[PDB]
Ligand binder design. Structure first.
Ligand SMILES: [Ca+2]
Ligand SMILES: [Ca+2]
Ligand SMILES: [Ca+2]
Ligand SMILES: [Ca+2]
Ligand SMILES: [Mn+2]
Ligand SMILES: [Mn+2]
Ligand SMILES: [Mn+2]
Ligand SMILES: [Mn+2]
Lengths: 237, 237, 237, 237
């Protein structure tokens, strides 16, 4: 009733769980215990951009977190979303804070996803494009402390009037229209997403990080999703 | 609180209103009293396909209802949706029946729509692709007697087990995610849609017709939307 | 100077090479000796549709040849196009005949391909859409006996005035604009293509088959590309 | 044999022709004598972005040249490209210099274009995406002094090693694949393009300007296309 696949950006390495010793990216299937991990070179206060693709033919969850001038960090995990995700899913954004401070602002957001059938070709599909959120932003489902329009951006985490990334925070947002994972006569399916993000830390010990996650249209933030729980996974591991 | 712009397919010409004397297409702004009209050559039991575009620069509501081998029928009206539609709209499908019988089945359905901002370029946008509806069809909002999956199609109107188009009927359906008409820093906006439809009449006196309409996320079928009221307009004219 | 990756549709099983004992699909890297194979259930005179995807993160050449009502046939091979294809490639269509007769008509043709950079996001990319070829068809590069506009279709192989698939034939066609495989600051690349095809055989012993292939902008049909050589590979194996 | 429709960015107002008295934008059909004009507020050394759309239903050439924080400048002209452009066209970029200096660098470039037929729906079409040009840039046709990869950008005009916009210059570039304006069974056609540009002037008296133009696959720069001739129109007016 509340299951999710997440692609997470980890700034604050919680050794106690199983994350490497520095900032890392990887795939989480069912829990905080990411299945695959990788090391990315944090650039505090710098502009970033994430990417993520997959499909049934191959069924391989892959990611690419890039930085300008800086070199690429990727990770790939083999999994059957067919077996994991609800036939119909929802797409949103999560970011987190707790003891540590950090900014979680989204500049641009893009989502592509299609479904190939038996009939002939070019069956079903959907796209959502973002470069600036509004005070309106009505085809979006925000959770908790997310803020849209702050500075004309999707700000997952709590911010002040001067910047000052707040702590002990948590919220998220998902596109209105559900998504279609797999189907009766579908033999070739696909998903594509990219997203620029902006993490800012006055501290050298930045918060927790960000995260792009897939779950049920019903997905809700659990208890103390705060902290390293990036509001993707309850206390279970 | 319940306003709409509609592109309608009129099979049953109700002289009493203002529709020409044979089947016609045109633009309806606020009421049944379509603003522009045109004559299209009905092909009962044959496969059809509608199209419709517009934008602010130009602000001209235009349409093209085609038939294979058959020649094109188009109509164009000058209007300010900026002035008419809610800043945030919804996209759906309507078809109608009353004293007259006719089929209103959708084979394929496509929706494209984008928003150009000041920042730089390629700001906001969305796409929805359809070639076959499901028993599921969960990212769709159906109204009344619409049926999804019947034969793997979106069937706006009431059908029997042998075909037999039902009469005195009415229903519709809209994509889940709202749409974004105009905005703060948007100076160049656009909308694009095409759709194949299938109207079937055992009778020579076919029902009412079909209709592609834009309204509020709140849009609901009025009283006796049945008949020529194609469930787009209440009794007001 | 003349290298290619091909996704081929094999109707006429030439045991002497290494193809299974019935019609099959698979990946060919450098030669006729396809690297991966699979069994698809031919439906002579019936409408078909092929699909094919891949990318660097994963680097896995995958395919899906479907038939309506009929079940799916797929194959997947792990390869480094980065290491194989010219930084800049060309996209076309090949089909073949020799001792055996068969039809090789294309109804629809679709090509999607993009390149993700370091700068920010949504870097480079291209699309080409086909549902009917012309007597014109000017942004297409046809080779040999291919015919465009015959019946408003791309007909790779030689046809008569009554149908009568010709034999001992060979030709192909590619989109004008070159394609961009990999690049300096590209860390996330992708390719997507689908295509409906129509193979017709008065005989029970149909020709050779079809094939979607990637090569150099310079790609030319070799000697006796005819036969099982599907005009993709010279005599080398 | 050499005809063109152009959307031009005019920095250097040549009163002697018919351009207003300050920088302006407008539509040129057959000649320098733009048919429609409008006033845009130049921002030297600042980042800009142009847009342009049209189609048969409506047949209205429209444009939007925007600047960040700054307000929009648009122009619209009614014309029959069906009657003017070759059934098959080419898409490129032009910029100009002469007595006056100015920079003409392109950051991003985007092209969308489709063709609706009788068959059913979603007939033909093409897309080209740009955010950074290469030393390679092989699916592009550059003319004269255009430079690709200079700083990872398409630089239409002649630049030095320190910047120093050169004078008395002229060149352009077009996408490889031709374009399809109108056709046999096409009743609903469309074209869409946006583009960010960067004009830089050490002087207060900047060169000539930029220009997005449509012509024949054969289009070549005429004599002294230099100057206000923005290399779009020969000496004829
Ligand atoms: Ca952690
Ligand atoms: Ca009527
Ligand atoms: Ca063979
Ligand atoms: Ca001038
Ligand atoms: Mn972790
Ligand atoms: Mn009417
Ligand atoms: Mn073989
Ligand atoms: Mn001028």
């Amino acid at each position: 009733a509340d299951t999710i696949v997440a692609v997470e950006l980890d700034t604050y390495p919680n050794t106690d769980i199983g994350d490497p010793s520095y900032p890392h990216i990887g795939i989480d299937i069912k829990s905080v215990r990411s299945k695959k991990t990788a090391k990315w070179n944090m650039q505090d206060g710098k502009v970033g951009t994430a990417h993520i693709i997959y499909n049934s033919v191959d069924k391989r969850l892959s990611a690419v977190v890039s930085y300008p001038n800086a070199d690429a960090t990727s990770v790939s995990y083999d999994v059957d979303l067919n077996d994991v995700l609800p036939e119909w899913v929802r797409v949103g954004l999560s970011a987190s804070t707790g003891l540590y401070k950090e900014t979680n602002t989204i500049l641009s957001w893009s989502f592509t996803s299609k479904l190939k059938s038996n009939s002939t070709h070019q069956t079903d599909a959907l796209h959502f494009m973002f470069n600036q959120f509004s005070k309106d932003q009505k085809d979006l489902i925000l959770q908790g402390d997310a803020t849209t329009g702050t500075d004309g951006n999707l700000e997952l985490t709590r911010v002040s009037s001067n910047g000052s990334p707040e702590g002990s925070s948590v919220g998220r947002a998902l596109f209105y229209a559900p998504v279609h994972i797999w189907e009766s006569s579908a033999t070739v399916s696909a998903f594509e997403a990219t997203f620029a993000f902006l993490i800012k830390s006055p501290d050298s010990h930045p918060a927790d990080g960000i995260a792009f996650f897939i779950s049920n249209i019903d997905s809700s933030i659990p208890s103390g999703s705060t902290g390293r729980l990036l509001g993707l996974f309850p206390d279970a591991n």
